[PDB]
Amino acid sequence: RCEEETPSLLWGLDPVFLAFAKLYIRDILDMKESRQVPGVFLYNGHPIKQVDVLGTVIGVRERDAFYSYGVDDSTGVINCIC
Amino acid sequence: LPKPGTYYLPWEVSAGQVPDGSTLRTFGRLCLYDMIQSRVTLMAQHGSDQHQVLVCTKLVEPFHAQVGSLYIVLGELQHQQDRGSVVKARVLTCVEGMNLPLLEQAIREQRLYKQERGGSQ
Amino acid sequence: DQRNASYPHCLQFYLQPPSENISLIEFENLAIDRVKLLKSVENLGVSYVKGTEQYQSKLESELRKLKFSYRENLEDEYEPRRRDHISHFILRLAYCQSEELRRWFIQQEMDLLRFRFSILPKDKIQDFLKDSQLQFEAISDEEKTLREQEIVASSPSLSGLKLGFESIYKIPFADALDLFRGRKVYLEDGFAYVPLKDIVAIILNEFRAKLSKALALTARSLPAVQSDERLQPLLNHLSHSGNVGKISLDQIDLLSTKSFPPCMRQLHKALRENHHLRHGGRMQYGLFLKGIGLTLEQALQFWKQEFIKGKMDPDKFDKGYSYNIRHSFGKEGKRTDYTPFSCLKIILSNPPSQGDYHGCPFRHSDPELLKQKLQSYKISPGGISQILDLVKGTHYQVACQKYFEMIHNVDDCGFSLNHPNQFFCESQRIL
Amino acid sequence: ETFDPTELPELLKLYYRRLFPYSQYYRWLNYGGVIKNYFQHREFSFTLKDDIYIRYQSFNNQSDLEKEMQKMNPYKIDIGAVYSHRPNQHNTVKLGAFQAQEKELVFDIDMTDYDDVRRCCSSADICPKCWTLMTMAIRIIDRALKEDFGFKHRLWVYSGRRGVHCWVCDESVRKLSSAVRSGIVEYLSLVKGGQDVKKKVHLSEKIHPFIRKSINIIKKYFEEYALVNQDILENKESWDKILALVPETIHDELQQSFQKSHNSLQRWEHLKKVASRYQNNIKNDKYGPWLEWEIMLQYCFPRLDINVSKGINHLLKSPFSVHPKTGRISVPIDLQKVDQFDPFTVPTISFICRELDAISTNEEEKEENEAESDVKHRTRDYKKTSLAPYVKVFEHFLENLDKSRKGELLKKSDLQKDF
DNA sequence: TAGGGTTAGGGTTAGGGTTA
């Protein structure tokens, strides 16, 4: 069956929407997005808007106005913008 | 971007239970720092058994050495023809006082949870 | 027999670190004494020329004054040899921070070793090589006579077939770079046939340089464990220890007619004439204008104007030239801000070719063209003769000083010229 | 047909799809894999459309290289040096530990650097008569490298517009430092001086064996080309600038002789006679005894550039490129047929694309119902094209290098007592 | 006649494709 994402009119009823969630980096890599509202992501019925990661930096790059950082948390790597 | 670093206790990698070219992160205690050839031999105990891992260091010079201390090494493994297994260091930090059993139980629990979540797919 | 075994000869490649124990004050004294001696020999070498008698006599006097080992009296050489050994390894520990410091140390040690070998008797050089871990090969008189013509036409200071009573050594090319570069040695399938004295000196010098480089590279990884609280002030002591206000975009012509030194006046004139310049001149000019108080926006406008006068397209300018200029000032990219080239570096930089104008005219210009350009600047005939004499003496900096004094109508400049920023800042102070 | 910049991209895509010799290119770069990941640590620098400059593009394997080449479709291909880590991950290692280690020694020759001497064309124009310049330059440099230093493998590539590049690819040369290469280039350079300097040679009485060999191998070409083709001594201003190369003591006499003479041959003969007379009558002259030799070298010797060889991380155009102005594909030049190399006969991208179309037309009735992979299809494709002699020469060079590797490994077996 | 003051509050956006 076509898994229908929960309607956007009921996202805020979750207590997780306004919080900083802790996730495995592989999960945040492999977890899907939402079509009705781009820019936000949906995981197992719980919409997620904010994440918190921790690990060892393994990549540094500088630009005109924003830094770059490649973090690792023993399962995957994601870029960071500061 | 590089590949992630999975944990591995010393005795498994000592027996060569990982594919060549994989990226791994392990621990141990330093035993000797061969100055001229840029080679590090660290050791880790296991009951009555002691295991040895060879670490190339050509990417972290300059580097202070603390004889008889624990270490954490992250990098890639290359199966050499005669030297056997040597890990190419990318980051090599020193930690002291951290108890091993908590760490070993931690990776055991994480592996168990990953396998448990793997039982649904 | 520790004393004799430790120090058999007045010369030594310095391959064995010592094992005795020394007091701290003696350590500091040896360090400062040898660094003073090295600086003095550097200055003496840069002032006079190699050989002669006054230069070597003054160097010998400096060595004897600083209680080091310089001669080979066969009595009581234990103390000077030991002091030289210890102090040399102390400075080896010291000068292992930056590549340029290593190069300077290697060059000065090379000069000192060349001097000491130049005061070494031939039987003693043979014994010193025998104690050294070096291997040489001697060719046979058959091929010696077979290759007579090439070895005599190479002119290694040879005087009309003087090869009688000589031994010729065969050396791979990658070890005799000094005679290799100057085209003074016959070459064949990666080999060199050479006379005795010059090549033995140069081969010893080159292998010593390579081995010292390798040892310095090895010792580079030691200071990671040099966390001792003591000796820290000494290492810090040995570790060594152009912002004029903003200017307009239209006074550059007058300042150039007034404040540009000769080493860049030709470049400015060519830029103002053809409105186009190649890489070697372009980076030099950009670095100089950056170092005299020109902003990013002012420099961009200046370059775009002077290149619009060169019949370009503004889109092409934005794509190539301003694009290069942005990283020329470290606006983006790696942003490693670059210091302007020094006078010495520019004089000893890449030799310009056709279509290029970078480089001081005192080194890379014809004497007649130099005289004509000086006359275009209204230089007195006496000043012209003095400039010509200084050029003949290879004292380009003194010629630049004379040009500064003539253009600014000052009897004495009073400051040694080392960088174009110094010239421009002093000119602005005068203005 | 006339190359048009408004039609190139599709032809470039087709070329990268079909004709680019990926197999031989990888075989050369891989070097047989005697050293672990030697090819894996190479730096590339493409140049996409709109003149955007990118670099540091490593490649894990040949198949990945083919896929990325097919997708990206770049204009210029370049080769860097071998580093201690994969270039695409250069930001993952501490600064200062990512240094260049080995690269191939190269030289460059710019045809435009002879404007003040040459008169056949103007600026960026070429003629068949001036090709002898780079021909004799190639001969001189190749002979000097082959004999004086004994470098075994050499590979000459024609850039496409005005230049020819040297790709020395021996074993004991890739490990050299910067100072040694600077010494090589200094020893191989004779034309010295900037714009302000007129005379490019200051030779004493003594002559080096290298100069002797050069002057011996340069006589057979100087006469015809210089006297007949270019006619250096034709006009008044010609010999007016000529006489600046000789002492003023005979300037008026030589000018009168040129006025009396009619053609350049007579003027050159009179110059030779006057020079020979002055050599027998040398009286306190700082000038060398080889006026004729030094003028021939000044107007005839090749000119190098120390900057392209001093650096170790520098970049230079890869072979088999596509110049965006004439469409001529950079091809190797045979060593034994250098005198029969016309620059204008090199096949172009448009001609080779029409050849591919005709090849498909032939395949419509000659090759049908083939269940082969892309490898064999592309093999027969570039076999049927006009690049066959060029790839054959490249393969012959690769076979020579392979034979050298076989000899070196057999020598290592002899030394190591492993049979 | 029993709590204090009771107030709703931060809730955007920023750009790669580079060497002496």
Swiss-Prot record, chain A:
Protein name (record): CST complex subunit STN1
Subunit structure: Component of the CST complex, composed of TEN1/C17orf106, CTC1/C17orf68 and STN1; in the complex interacts directly with TEN1 and CTC1. Interacts with ACD/TPP1, POT1 and POLA1.
Family: Belongs to the STN1 family.
Localization terms from the record: Nucleus; Chromosome, Telomere
Recorded disease: Cerebroretinal microangiopathy with calcifications and cysts 2: An autosomal recessive, multisystemic disorder characterized by intrauterine growth retardation and, later in life, premature aging symptoms, including poor growth, graying hair, liver fibrosis, portal hypertension, esophageal varices, osteopenia, pancytopenia, hypocellular bone marrow, and vascular telangiectasia resulting in gastrointestinal bleeding. Brain calcifications and white matter changes are responsible for signs including spasticity, ataxia, or dystonia observed in some patients.
Gene of this entry: STN1
Anything else known: Cells expressing STN1 mutants defective for dimerization with TEN1 display elongated telomeres and telomere defects associated with telomere uncapping.
Curated annotation (Swiss-Prot), chain B:
CC terms in the record's Gene Ontology section: chromosome, telomeric region; CST complex; nucleoplasm; nucleus
DNA-binding region: 1-121
One Pfam family hit: Ten1_2
GO BP terms: negative regulation of telomere maintenance via telomerase; telomere capping
Compartments (UniProt record): Nucleus; Chromosome, Telomere
Family as reported in the entry's similarity comment: Belongs to the TEN1 family.
PANTHER family, sorted: CST COMPLEX SUBUNIT TEN1 (PTHR33905:SF1)
Naturally occurring in which organism (per UniProt): Homo sapiens (Human)
Protein name: CST complex subunit TEN1
GO molecular function per UniProt: single-stranded DNA binding; telomerase inhibitor activity; telomeric DNA binding
Superkingdom of origin organism: Eukaryota
Swiss-Prot record, chain C:
Region (RNA:DNA duplex-binding): 276-418
Cofactor: [4Fe-4S] cluster
Chain residue ranges for the region called Interacts with PRIM1: 242-431
Binding positions ([4Fe-4S] cluster): C263, C343, C360, C400
GO CC field: alpha DNA polymerase:primase complex; nucleoplasm
Keyword Iron-sulfur in annotation: yes
Pfam families reported in the protein's UniProt record: DNA_primase_lrg
BP GO annotations: DNA replication initiation; DNA replication, synthesis of primer
Gene Ontology molecular function, alphabetical: 4 iron, 4 sulfur cluster binding; DNA binding; DNA/RNA hybrid binding; metal ion binding
Source superkingdom: Eukaryota
Cofactor mode of binding and number, as noted: Binds 1 [4Fe-4S] cluster.
Keywords from the UniProt entry: 4Fe-4S, DNA replication, DNA-binding, Iron, Iron-sulfur, Metal-binding, Phosphoprotein, Primosome
InterPro entries listed in its UniProt record: DNA_primase_lsu_euk, DNA_primase_lsu_euk/arc
Family: Belongs to the eukaryotic-type primase large subunit family.
Protein task: Regulatory subunit of the DNA primase complex and component of the DNA polymerase alpha complex (also known as the alpha DNA polymerase-primase complex) which play an essential role in the initiation of DNA synthesis. During the S phase of the cell cycle, the DNA polymerase alpha complex (composed of a catalytic subunit POLA1, an accessory subunit POLA2 and two primase subunits, the catalytic subunit PRIM1 and the regulatory subunit PRIM2) is recruited to DNA at the replicative forks via direct interactions with MCM10 and WDHD1.
PANTHER family in the record: DNA PRIMASE LARGE SUBUNIT
Name of the protein in its database record: DNA primase large subunit
Protein source organism: Homo sapiens
UniProtKB/Swiss-Prot annotation, chain D:
Protein residues bound to Mg(2+) 1: D108, D110
Recorded consequence of changing D108N: Decreases the binding affinity for NTPs
Superkingdom of origin organism: Eukaryota
Span(s) of short sequence motif Zinc knuckle motif: 120-130
One of the record's GO cellular component terms: nucleoplasm
Coiled-coil annotated spans: none
Annotated positions binding a ribonucleoside 5'-triphosphate: 108-110, 159-165, 314-317, 323
Impact noted for substituting C300R: In PDIL; loss of function in DNA replication initiation; contrary to the wild type, the mutant does not rescue reduced cell proliferation, prolonged S-phase and impaired DNA replication when transfected in patient cells
Ranges of compositional bias, category Acidic residues: 362-372
Pfam families linked: DNA_primase_S
Function statement: Catalytic subunit of the DNA primase complex and component of the DNA polymerase alpha complex (also known as the alpha DNA polymerase-primase complex - primosome/replisome) which play an essential role in the initiation of DNA synthesis. During the S phase of the cell cycle, the DNA polymerase alpha complex (composed of a catalytic subunit POLA1, an accessory subunit POLA2 and two primase subunits, the catalytic subunit PRIM1 and the regulatory subunit PRIM2) is recruited to DNA at the replicative forks via direct interactions with MCM10 and WDHD1.
Protein name in UniProt: DNA primase small subunit
Gene that specifies this protein: PRIM1
